[PDB]
Each structure stands twice: as structure tokens, then as C-alpha cells.
Design a binder for this molecule. Structure first.
Ligand SMILES: C[C@]12CC[C@H](OS(=O)(=O)O)CC1=CC[C@@H]1[C@@H]2CC[C@]2(C)C(=O)CC[C@@H]12
Length: 1188
């Protein structure tokens, strides 16, 4: 529903149909459903289909030639017929813009020749004043039509482009999915396609600027003659100069984007891995790495911002220079300054200033930015894009030494389960992809019948309700739904959830546990009730008991009659499977906010520089605008002084002060524009370092009480604004605000009575502003909140591309994208239309001011000179567009300051205890590795429960101790206390030193940790092992041999200098664990803390790391958290935490022989044979340790 369909022409132009929503919004806060729908022209589907049609056409034409296709060509062939008629606005608007200076000139002419008693003269002047008023209204209306329509053009271009990007993304080949990663594609939408909103704004000025410059040259030629050409020479120097600056700025910005992208990726992994960075004490290395990336980036930003500031200063002072040279040569040729000529010419140059030195350079800049965007988009659009298997062989990459699947033949039929079994990387998932048909055969054939269900190994969940993620477009139905929810072992959680299965889910299921989203992902598949289930190991996404529970209930009971193809290692379940196919090396081996106060402004500007510099900044701004106003006032003063005069003015005095006034205007304009960027970029720099130091020393509790995305937004969005958009908007607002104050000041200074109409007029403005703002900030909230889901959907679909492609769900997912997109388009449509509603009426009251100035000058004409009125009116005419831009820019400024307020708070976080005390331990300390807990109590927060109480234990230099206990019993709490991840109560001694009497780095660097899950960081394999670069390469190779990885690195081209991926996918999980083990080996320390290190490792690798532990750390005291009690059963003693209480600490055999020990209960829970093995092992090692 949209009343713009029903609105009469007047209501279409002036948007009167928004008025009820203004009334509502003033009375109450606007919400998502207070929002009229977009017209059928703007609908995303209809609007993207056309551009794709023309892209197909141009691809075919280039295909018939040999050349590569052009995407700019498809865009033009599509949108030219609509966009070109918009130039009639531009044509009529710019033609009236050059006529209106002529009417102005005839008004000023009445004052130049004002006679005391001619009635007919007065009547004609009133006629021109009415014509001038009407010209102003028509200009305003055409301006607003044009800008409203080009903005809709840009919106539709973005919408169609985004539709195409999304359409292409769904069909990329898995090879294209390899060289392209989610972050790049999402940056397309989030960064590059947003450049199309700006493209269409100024393109009609690529011809109208030059054509209007030629027309203005002819008009000026009749006004003043040859002197016109000096100003036009300056104009044609500015054209190449400003266009070179714009292209060079675009180049610098294109390069700096790389540093920005690298910094944001490093910062993403820092914030994500901050706990391990803290335990390793590697904070110095990331401090350095981020410091250097940020230093490079801020140098690029400083240079880029100086270029942009020079372009802005060149616009601001363009007509000052153009007028200065024009009238300098005009007076050197013997002419005289008159108010009519001067201000007519000043007005014409004002028009040329806008179109040629603002809109034409702006167009070149934005087309350049658009071409880098279009190049990336074409590089994306051109990227590559019963059951029976026989003789199957295939390559992922023909450059491989071998095929990646080979010599494959098998068949499976209704009522069967086929297991795919074997080592990691044996091609099992690749096999499933082949059966799906994602991987075509290079030889052999695949044939399948019925619908296929593909369940990815990693779970996938998208927006909406958890039930929306499960149903996946299917009808909700009680019986099948209940059968699904019970078979997927999920009912309990959906009952415990207060909003049940209607709980809303985040961008990556961040509110869900891994097992929860896993069970969601499986439930989805089972709900589809397909014929063939390709089960790519759904079970490793849940705990071992739930894994067998899902195998029995979902796979055996629910999928009972189906074909199944289950990738798994749980061979113990496969007694119930029909057949197993074993792969190796790809070949078959076997077959069978919203408001901020003055304090935020002060803090922001003072974080940049010492307040003395800010006083100088204010003074430089005042001086810039004062010299501006004064140069124009000087022309008008010169015109009045000429008009008072044979003899002539002293060109030395007048032209000298003119030259000084104009030189200081240029000087302060330049320094003002540069110093704003320096101060505000130094502010962003200081605040980034303060926020980075705070986040580095902030306690872990800060990272529990914030999600990662929320903190990373401070570094991406908010600091992004503070580097790029905010300083530019500040300079824009400051420049426009001082212009407006100068207009009003000149007006009130020339006719003081204007102050009276200005009172009601000012009151109306302020009421209107308030009444608008109330709703304006609502829609800006609602724009942001409807923008975010779009990127979320893109990213989620990219992660789940296998599954949506498997379900043939591309159609519905394009509909979803279009729905999100057109919902955002309604918010963007209210942004556009509401911002026009306000701009129109601001220009309305501004036009009343123009009317008042004009007519009041005629009412008061006995009291004024021609140059006074010419000055006042020229300035008044300039108020149109300026004043509304000022007000809306002010709203932009205040909206961005919410980002500043969000980062300034993170400069004030609480901080952990100092890394080093004034007391420091001996360099030989720890000399023995003694650990003592004595009446220790520990809680993650002062307001939280005591998760550890009365913890009291000794750990000597030689013994090995296991840490055991139920989930949440406090095991991880012990690691947190020992590293002082939260400050413990009580006494902790290490080598007769209280851990609390030394710095955090003293003890953190002297304890080794093997995390629960390995993490690798982008950069060299040397960095991931020796980030401080103090070891010899001999030691690195010894360690890499010990961790059995040397062969892979030497096979890799760079050896240790090979560039690793941020997720380490270059290496297997076991290889990642081996990187961690290598780090621990290279750091010789007395005490090693092991965190569940092998609970999920395969036995044939677990025994390897067990042996490596027995060898490389035999001298160390070792504290081991372990689910896999076989990893710790040969400890000297074991600690059992009941619930924050050390209830057991004794020899494992002595414990287990007490059948009532909690440790014995925990082993018995495993099973009788497991407990028998564990007890026998403990008994024999206890005997042998008593024997020596
Ligand atoms: C033309 C004007 C207003 C007057 C300014 O002159 S200034 O001396 O006050 O800076 C410059 C200026 C800059 C940007 C202009 C603006 C008017 C409104 C415009 C055209 C839009 O919708 C998008 C860009 C906008």
C-alpha cells in the first residue's frame, strides 16, 4: 500500500501524503510496519531481471567477437532511455539558473537609477521582483524533482546490481568458491555497490557543466566582454587539475582499502582469539602488527584526506579566484566596477562554480570509484560457474599430480545405509559432492533417482526463527514436526526456550550452541523427508552420546526406509549400516544512543590535539569566513564608492586590499580545510590507540559481556566513519553553517527591520525542525536496522551454498533477498521522501526570505544604495539549497557522533593488573615450578557466584597432575585462576613468590598452555612458531620434525615462509594441534598446562602426541584437563572438582580403589571395560612407581 499511487500531481510533487506518518511519528515512535510499500517499478525482482537480460546480450555479442565483454555497456544499454529524459530537468533548471541572474540585474538596476517620483518604474520593478520570486520557486521545484529522481535512479541501479551479484553468487563453481571467500563477496554489497547511489547524481553535469560554461561565457561576453576569458582560463585549468586530483584520490583510496581490509581481518582474529593471545602473552606481537598496519593505513588516509581537502578548498575558493582574475583583468583594461555588472557576473560564476567545479569533478570521482566497483563486479560475474557410480575419477585442479577421486564404482538402493569411511581427506565429502552432482565426473558416470538431501558436515543456520530455519519453506505440520523434533533430539531445548521454536536467531546462530545449531541443521533435512540422504557426518557436530542418539533415532528410526550415504568415523555404529566404502588418497581401498551532549564534542576534539591547537582551529575558521564575506562586501563597497564619483579610484589601494582579502581567503580556506582533517584524523588515531590498548588490557569478562561483532563494529564502522566520512561531513557542515550565518548577518546588517519577519520565520523553522527531527531519527534507526539483515542473508547463504543449491532453493532465496532488499527499499524510500518533504519546506521558508528581502528592499528603497541591495540579494539567492543542505548535514553530523560516543566509552574500560610489577622475579625464576593453592576462592566477577571455593593444593616440581570434574564443575576456572584471568581471592604461591606479587607477564610467559582448539594467525609459519624472531632456524626445523610437519612445509613452496590462511585450512586439525605443540616445544618452560588436548583426536594420532608429551616434557610439572581419562591415567595425582570444591586429590590407584571416589564414578560412567582398563593401568603404573 502506498498513497503516492492515489496522490494528485501536487501531492506527488510536495509529498503531502507523508503528513499522517508525521502526525503519528510526532505522537509515537515509528516502527517497521508504519512504512508504506514501494511501487512496482522499484520491486527488486522486476528491476534486476532487466539488467541481467542486457548483460546476457552483451556477453553474447562479445562472445561472437573475441573481445572480453563490458559491464558498463550492459548498464548503459539498459538504463539510458529512462535516465536521459531526466536531463530535461537539468536543461530547464540550468537555463533558468542563467536567466535568473539577469532578472537580479534588472532589480539592482532600479536602485542604480532610483528616481524620486517615477510611478511606472516602481511598478515594473515589482513585476521583476515577482518574476524573480517565481523563478526561485520554479528552480527549487525542478531542483527537488531532479535530485529526487536521480536518487531513485541510483537506488534502482544498486538494487538491480545487488540482485545480479546475489544471482551470480548462487551458481559459482567450487573452484570459484575457492579463490573467492565470503568476506570479499560481502564487501561487494557493503562497500562497492553502495557506489552506484552516488554515480547517477551528477552524470547529467558531464555535459551540462561544459555547455552551461559555454552559455555563461557568451552571456558574460555581453556583460563585460573579453575579460570573461581570464575566468574561463582559470576554469579550464581547474578542470584537468581537479579531475587529476579526483582520479589520484580514487587511486589512493583503492590502495588504502587493502591495508584497511588487512587491519580489519587481523583485528577480527585478535578479538576472536583474545584469550589465547593473553595466555600466550603474544600481545606484544599483535600490538606491533596492528601498530604497523594502522601506521601505514593512517599515512594513506592522511594523504588521501589532504587531497580531498584540497579539492574542497578549491571549490570553496573557486569563484573567489575566478572573480578576482576576471575583475582584475577587467579593471586593468580600463573598466569600472558597478553593482549591476559585478553581482550579475558573481551570480553567473556562482552557477558555473556549482556545476563545473563541484558537480563535474564529483562526477569524475564517482565514475572512477564506480569503475573500480564495476571491475570487481565483472571479475565476480565472469568467474567460473537407486544410486550408481561407475569408473568415477575427477580433479579439483588439473595441476594436481593425481586425480582427487579415482577408480570409484558403487551402488546403493532403497532400504540401505551406505557408510563412507576412511582417513581425513580421503575424498568422502568430495564423493558426496560428486553423488550430488556438484563434482562432475572427468570419467565414469553417476545416476540417481528421486530427491536428494545433502547435510553438510558443518551446520548452517540463517535468519528468522529456528523453526523457520528447520521448515525451510515447508508447511508447518504438528505430526511430522513432532516426529522431526523428537527424532533430532531437540524437543527439550525448544521447550526450555521461552519463545520456544519462535526464538529469533542471529547472523550465525550466535545465540545457539554448536550442538543446538547442529541439531537445527539436521532437523531441517529430516523435515524434507527426501529419498536419498547424503549425510556428510552430521554427528561430529554433537557430543558422543548425542551422536549415537541421533544415529539411532534420526538415521535408523526416522530415515529407516531411505537410501542413506553416511560419511562418518563411528564404525561402531555401522553394524547397522548396509554397506561401507573405504577411500584413501581419493581412491577406493575397500568396498563392502540517539542523543549526545557537549562533553562528547569536547572529548572528541580534545583527543585530537592540545586545546591551543583547537583555539587556533576555531580562529582559522572564523577568519576564513570573515575574509570570504569581506571580499564580497569589498566588491559591494567598491561599487558604492565608484557610484559616488574627472577622477577615479586608486586601483592600488582597492585592488591591493582586494588581493590581500582574496589571498587570505585562499590561505585560510586551505589551512582551514587541511587542519580540520589533521585534528580529526589525529583524534581518530589517538582514540584508536586508546581503545586498542584498553581492549588489549581489558579483562576477559569484558569479552564475555559483549559479542564479537559488537566490538568489531567499533573498529570497522565507527572508526571507519571517524577516518573517512565524519571529518568530511564536519568540514561540510562547518563550511555551510558559516555561509548561512554570513547570509543572515549581511541581510540583518543591510536592513535591520528584516529581524522582525525573521522572528516568526525563525520560530517556524525551529518548530518545523523539531517536528521533523522527531521522525527523522526514527527513520535513520529504521534504515540501519533494515540494512543489516541483507548482508546477513548474503553471508549466511554463502556459508550454506551447498545446501540451498542441493534443495534447488535458489528461487526462494532470491525472493528472500528481494524481500529484505525491498523492505530496506521502503526505509530508503522514506529516507528519500521524508528528507525531500523537509528540504522542500526549508526551501519554502528560505524563499519567503528571498521574497521579504526583494520586496522589503523596494518598500524601503529610499534608504538603500544599489551595492547594499545587490550584496544582500545575491547572498539571499545563494541561500536556496545551502540552508537546507546545512540543516540536513547538521543532522548527519549528530547522527555520526553516536559512533564517536560508542568508541570513547571503550577508552575508559577497567584494566587488568599491570603486566610487570616494580618487583620482578629472578631470570632463573621459576627455578623449580612449585605451585601452591591455599584457601583460594575465585569468581569470574565480584557480582557472580564463587565458582571456586577454598581451593587448596600443592603441586611440586616433578609430579604430573590431572584436572578432572563434571561439566561446569570449575575445571576451566582453575586455568582462569592460575593465569589470573580473573583476580582470585586468597594465596597462590609459585616458587615462594605470591603470583599476586608479580606482574601478569612474569608468570604468564613462564607457563605453557595448549588450548582446547588450535588457532593459526595470518602470516608466515615462522610467525606462528616464533613471533618475536629470537630462535635459530635450526631449532624451528627440529621442532617441525618433532611435530611431524617438516615434510609438508618443505613440500610447500616457501618452506616456513609459505603464507597461511586465516583459518589454517591449508592444514588439518591434527596439523593445527601440531603447530600448537611446536609452539610449546620452542618455549622451554617448567610447567605445561594441557587443556583437553586429545579428547577428540583419533587414537592413531593421540598416541603420537602422548608419546611426544612423554618425551619432550618429561622434566615438567604437567596439569592436564581431560575428558579422555586415558590421557591422564598415568598421572602421579588427580584433582577432582565436585562443584568449585577440591574434594579429591590423591594417587589415581589409591582413589580408584576407593570405589566411592568421584573419580571412580566418572570412570564407571564410561563403562565396565573402560574402567577395568583404566584401573589396571593405574594399578600397574602405581606398582612400578613404588618399585624404583
Ligand atoms: C550545492 C550544495 C549547497 C551549497 C554549498 O555551498 S557551500 O558554500 O555552502 O559549501 C555546496 C553544496 C554542496 C553539496 C550539494 C549542495 C546542495 C544539495 C546537493 C546538490 C545534494 O543534494 C547533494 C550534494 C549537495
Amino acid at each position: 500500500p502506498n498513497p503516492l499511487r492515489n496522490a494528485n500531481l501536487c501531492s506527488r510533487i510536495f509529498f503531502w501524503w507523508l503528513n499522517p506518518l508525521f502526525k503519528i511519528g510526532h505522537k509515537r515512535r515509528l516502527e517497521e510496519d508504519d512504512m508504506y510499500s514501494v511501487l512496482p517499478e522499484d520491486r527488486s525482482q522486476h528491476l534486476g531481471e532487466e539488467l541481467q537480460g542486457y548483460w546476457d546480450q552483451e556477453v553474447l555479442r562479445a562472445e561472437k567477437d573475441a573481445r572480453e565483454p563490458s559491464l558498463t555497456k550492459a548498464i548503459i544499454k539498459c538504463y539510458w532511455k529512462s535516465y536521459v529524459v531526466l536531463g530535461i530537468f537539468t536543461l530547464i533548471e540550468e537555463s533558468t539558473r542563467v536567466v535568473q541572474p539577469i532578472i537580479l540585474g534588472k532589480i539592482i538596476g532600479y536602485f542604480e537609477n532610483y528616481d524620486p517620483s517615477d510611478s511606472a518604474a516602481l511598478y515594473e520593478a515589482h513585476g521583476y521582483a515577482g518574476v524573480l520570486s517565481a523563478c526561485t520557486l520554479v528552480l527549487a521545484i525542478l531542483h527537488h524533482l531532479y535530485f529526487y529522481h536521480v536518487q531513485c535512479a541510483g537506488m534502482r541501479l544498486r538494487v538491480a546490481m545487488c540482485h545480479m551479484i546475489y544471482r551470480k553468487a548462487l551458481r559459482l563453481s567450487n573452484s570459484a568458491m575457492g579463490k573467492t571467500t565470503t568476506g570479499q563477496i560481502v564487501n561487494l554489497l557493503s562497500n562497492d555497490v553502495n557506489k552506484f547511489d552516488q554515480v547517477t547524481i551528477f552524470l547529467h553535469f558531464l555535459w551540462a557543466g561544459p555547455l552551461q560554461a559555454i552559455v555563461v561565457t557568451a552571456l558574460l561576453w555581453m556583460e563585460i566582454g573579453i575579460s570573461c576569458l581570464a575566468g574561463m582560463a582559470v576554469l579550464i585549468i581547474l578542470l584537468p587539475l581537479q579531475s587529476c586530483i579526483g582520479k589520484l584520490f580514487s587511486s589512493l583510496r583503492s590502495k588504502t582499502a587493502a591495508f584497511t581490509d588487512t587491519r580489519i581481518r587481523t583485528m577480527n582474529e585478535v578479538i576472536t582469539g583474545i584469550r589465547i593471545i593473553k595466555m600466550y602473552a603474544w600481545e606484544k606481537s599483535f600490538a606491533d602488527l596492528i601498530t604497523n598496519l594502522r601506521r601505514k593505513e593512517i599515512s594513506k588516509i592522511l594523504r588521501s584526506s589532504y587531497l580531498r581537502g584540497m579539492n574542497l578548498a578549491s571549490f570553496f575558493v573557486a569563484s573567489k579566484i575566478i572573480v578576482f582574475v576576471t575583475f582584475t583583468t577587467y579593471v586593468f583594461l580600463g573598466n569600472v566596477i558597478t553593482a549591476s555588472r559585478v553581482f550579475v557576473a558573481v551570480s553567473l560564476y556562482g552557477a558555473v562554480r556549482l556545476t563545473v567545479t563541484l558537480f563535474f569533478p564529483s562526477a569524475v570521482e564517482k565514475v572512477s570509484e564506480a569503475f573500480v566497483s564495476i571491475r570487481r563486479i565483472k571479475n565476480f560475474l565472469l568467474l567460473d560457474e537407486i544410486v550408481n557410480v561407475q569408473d568415477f575419477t575427477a580433479f579439483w585442479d588439473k595441476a594436481s599430480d593425481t586425480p582427487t577421486l579415482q577408480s570409484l564404482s558403487f551402488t546403493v538402493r532403497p532400504g540401505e545405509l551406505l557408510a563412507v569411511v576412511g582417513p581425513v581427506g580421503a575424498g568422502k565429502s568430495s564423493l558426496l559432492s560428486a553423488v550430488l552432482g556438484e563434482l562432475p565426473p572427468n570419467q565414469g558416470q553417476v545416476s540417481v533417482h528421486g530427491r536428494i538431501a545433502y547435510v553438510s558436515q558443518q551446520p548452517w543456520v540463517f535468519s528468522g526463527t529456528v523453526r523457520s530455519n528447520i521448515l525451510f519453506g515447508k508447511k508447518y505440520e504438528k505430526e511430522r514436526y513432532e516426529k522431526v523434533i523428537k527424532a533430532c533430539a531437540l524437543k527439550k531445548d525448544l521447550q526450555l526456550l521461552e519463545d520456544g521454536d519462535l526464538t529469533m536467531i542471529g547472523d550465525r546462530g550466535t545465540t545457539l550452541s554448536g550442538g543446538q545449531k547442529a541439531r537445527v541443521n539436521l532437523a531441517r533435512a529430516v523435515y524434507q523427508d527426501a529419498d536419498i540422504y547424503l549425510l556428510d557426518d552430521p554427528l561430529s557436530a554433537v557430543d558422543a552420546e548425542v551422536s549415537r542418539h541421533l544415529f539411532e533415532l534420526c538415521i535408523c528410526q526416522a530415515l529407516h526406509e531411505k537410501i542413506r550415504i553416511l560419511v562418518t568415523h563411528q564404525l561402531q555404529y555401522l553394524k547397522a549400516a548396509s554397506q561401507i566404502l573405504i577411500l584413501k588418497d581419493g581412491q577406493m581401498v575397500q568396498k563392502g544512543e540517539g542523543k549526545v551532549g557537549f562533553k562528547a564534542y569536547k572529548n572528541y576534539f580534545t583527543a585530537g590535539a592540545h586545546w591551543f591547537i583547537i583555539i587556533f582551529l576555531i580562529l582559522v575558521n572564523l577568519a576564513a569566513q570573515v575574509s570570504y564575506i569581506l571580499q564580497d562586501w569589498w566588491l559591494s563597497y567598491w561599487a558604492n564608492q565608484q557610484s559616488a564619483l574627472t577622477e577615479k579610484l586608486d586601483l592600488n589601494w582597492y585592488l591591493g586590499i582586494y588581493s590581500g582579502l582574496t589571498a587570505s581567503t585562499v590561505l585560510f580556506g586551505i589551512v582551514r580545510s587541511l587542519l580540520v582533517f589533521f585534528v580529526l584524523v589525529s583524534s581518530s588515531q589517538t582514540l584508536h590507540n586508546q581503545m586498542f590498548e584498553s581492549i588489549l588490557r581489558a579483562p576477559v569478562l569484558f569479552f564475555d559481556r559483549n559479542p564479537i561483532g559488537r566490538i568489531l563494529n567499533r573498529f570497522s564502522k565507527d572508526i571507519g566513519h571517524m577516518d573517512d566520512l565524519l571529518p568530511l561531513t564536519y568540514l561540510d557542515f562547518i563550511q555551510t553553517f558559516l555561509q548561512v550565518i554570513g547570509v543572515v548577518g549581511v541581510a540583518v546588517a543591510v536592513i535591520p527591520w528584516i529581524a522582525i519577519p525573521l522572528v516568526p520565520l525563525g520560530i517556524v523553522f525551529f518548530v518545523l525542525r523539531r517536528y521533523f527531527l522527531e521522525t527523522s531519527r526514527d527513520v535513520k534507526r529504521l534504515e540501519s536496522t533494515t540494512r543489516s539483515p541483507v548482508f546477513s542473508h548474503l553471508s549466511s547463504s554463502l556459508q550454506g551454498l551447498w545446501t540451498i543449491r542441493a534443495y534447488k532453493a535458489e528461487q526462494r532465496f532470491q525472493e528472500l533477498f528481494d524481500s529484505h532488499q525491498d523492505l530496506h527499499s521502503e526505509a530508503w524510500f522514506l529516507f528519500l521522501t521524508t528528507s525531500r518533504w523537509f528540504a522542500v519546506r526549508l526551501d519554502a521558508i528560505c524563499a519567503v526570505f528571498v521574497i521579504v528581502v526583494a520586496f522589503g528592499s523596494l518598500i524601503l528603497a529610499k534608504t538603500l544604495d544599489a551595492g547594499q541591495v545587490g550584496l544582500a540579494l545575491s547572498y539571499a539567492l545563494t541561500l536556496m539549497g545551502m540552508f537546507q543542505w546545512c540543516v540536513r548535514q547538521s543532522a548527519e553530523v549528530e547522527n555520526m557522533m553516536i559512533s564517536v560516543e560508542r568508541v570513547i566509552e571503550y577508552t575508559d574500560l577497567e584494566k587488568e593488573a599491570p603486566w610487570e610489577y616494580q618487583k620482578r622475579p629472578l631470570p632463573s625464576w621459576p627455578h623449580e615450578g612449585v605451585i601452591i593453592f591455599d584457601n583460594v576462592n575465585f569468581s569470574y566477577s565480584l557480582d557472580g557466584p564463587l565458582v571456586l571455593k577454598h581451593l587448596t593444593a600443592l603441586i611440586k616440581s616433578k609430579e604430573k597432575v590431572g584436572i578432572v570434574g563434571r561439566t561446569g564443575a570449575g575445571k576451566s576456572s582453575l586455568i582462569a585462576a592460575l593465569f589470573r584471568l580473573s583476580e582470585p581471592e586468597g594465596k597462590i604461591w609459585i616458587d615462594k613468590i605470591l603470583t599476586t606479587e608479580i606482574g601478569l607477564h612474569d608468570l604468564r610467559k613462564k607457563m605453557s598452555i595448549i588450548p582446547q582448539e588450535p588457532v593459526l594467525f595470518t602470516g608466515t609459519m615462522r610467525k606462528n612458531l616464533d613471533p618475536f624472531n629470537e630462535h635459530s632456524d635450526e631449532e624451528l626445523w627440529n621442532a617441525l620434525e618433532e611435530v611431524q610437519l617438516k615434510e609438508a612445509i618443505e613440500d610447500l613452496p616457501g618452506k616456513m615462509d609459505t603464507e597461511l590462511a586465516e583459518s589454517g585450512s591449508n592444514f588439518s586439525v591434527g596439523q593445527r594441534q601440531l603447530v600448537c605443540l611446536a609452539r610449546a616445544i620452542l618455549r622451554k618452560n617448567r610447567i605445561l598446562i594441557i587443556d583437553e588436548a586429545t579428547a577428540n583426536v583419533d587414537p592413531r594420532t593421540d598416541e603420537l602426541i602422548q608419546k611426544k608429551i612423554r618425551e619432550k616434557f618429561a622434566h615438567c610439572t604437567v596439569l592436564t584437563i581431560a575428558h579422555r581419562l586415558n590421557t591422564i591415567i598415568d598421572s602421579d595425582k588427580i584433582m577432582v572438582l565436585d562443584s568449585g570444591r577440591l574434594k579429591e586429590y590423591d594417587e589415581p590407584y589409591v582413589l580408584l580403589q576407593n570405589r566411592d571416589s568421584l573419580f571412580y564414578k566418572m570412570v564407571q560412567q564410561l563403562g565396565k571395560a573402560e574402567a577395568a582398563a583404566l584401573t589396571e593401568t593405574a594399578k600397574q603404573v602405581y606398582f612400578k612407581r613404588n618399585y624404583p
